[PDB]
Structures are given as structure tokens and as C-alpha cells.
Amino acid sequence: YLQGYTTRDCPQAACSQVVSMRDFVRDPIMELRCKIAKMKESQEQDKRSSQAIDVL
Amino acid sequence: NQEQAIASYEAAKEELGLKIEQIAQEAQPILALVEAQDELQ
């Protein structure tokens, strides 16, 4: 989103904050959320995929 | 058919085990820890 320009507005909707790469820092909270969500989905998907093969 | 499957399983697992033994032998090293310790002291 910030590619090609030094600073650009915040990509989120209704946000006008002009940001750059240095303005963004690693978010441990988002990694935690996505990690947890993906692991839950992975457990669900492994069970679903196994039964998804049991169908064939 | 099941005996053929068993033979294929055995061959594939033998090959995999050889490769895994090689990779385990390749898993020696652990880096910047020594340099950090030296700089600290």
C-alpha cells in the first residue's frame, strides 16, 4: 500500500493517517490473534479433511 | 494388492529413513551467541 511513495495514508477504511514503513512496527498482538485463529482452523480442517477423505 | 502396497511402503520408508538419518547428521550447529557473550564480557 505504501509502495512507490515515501508516505501514504492509512490503508484501513475511514483512516487518514499518513504513514510509512518506519511508522509501522511489528504487532505481537496481531501475530498472536492470527496464529491462534489459524491453529483453530488447522485443527478444524484436519478433522474435516480426514472425514472429507472418508467420504470418497 | 495389499501385499504390493506393503512392499511399496517398506521401500519408501527405507528410503525416507536413510534421508532422515542424513538430515539428522546434518543437524549439528545449534550463532551470534558467542559474539554477544564476548562483547558483553
Partner: protein
Amino acid sequence: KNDDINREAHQLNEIRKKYTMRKSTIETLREKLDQLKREARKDVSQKIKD
């Protein structure tokens, strides 16, 4: 005539046993493999929750 009818009987007996063979395929591959795969799961929610 008797020999001809006997040959026909043997052909139809082999046909019926091929049918029984397909029935055996049903019983083992259709069901025994189905049961083995169904129980092999042991509801993986088991090992997952372990």
C-alpha cells in the same frame, strides 16, 4: 442334449460364482475397509485434544 445342458449349467454356475465374488468384494472392500477407516479415526479429536 444332456451334455449341452450340463455345459450351460456349468457356465451359469461360474457366472453365479463371479456374482458371489463381487458380493465378497462388497463385503470386504466396501464395508470392512469402510469400518477400518471409520474406526482408524478414533475421532481424531482424541489425539488432537491429547
